[PDB]
């Protein structure tokens, strides 16, 4: 497991440019990044597909349901701080 805190920043008329899904693991909800659009605020901050989002602005989002994490991120405005968890095979 690697861990990295990212800070994403966008303009008002603009999305962060990533998508998430929430998996009910065996139930512990884990939310991870399923897509990141190229050259988006997300990409530039270092966000990568497969990253688990463990925290949003120091809120532990592990165990949180999908709708709440979406609302949390949307409530964050234009600055978003994500603790990511990831690893690579190679
Ligand atoms: Cl949405």
From Swiss-Prot:
Subcellular location(s) per record: Cytoplasm, Perinuclear region; Cell membrane; Postsynaptic cell membrane
Domain PDZ: 5-86
Disulfide bonds: none
Subunit structure: Heteromer. Composed of TAMALIN, CYTH2 and at least one GRM1. Also interacts with CYTH3, GRM2, GRM3 and GRM5.
Function in brief: Plays a role in intracellular trafficking and contributes to the macromolecular organization of group 1 metabotropic glutamate receptors (mGluRs) at synapses.
Name used for this protein in its record: Protein TAMALIN
Annotated source species: Homo sapiens
Gene: TAMALIN
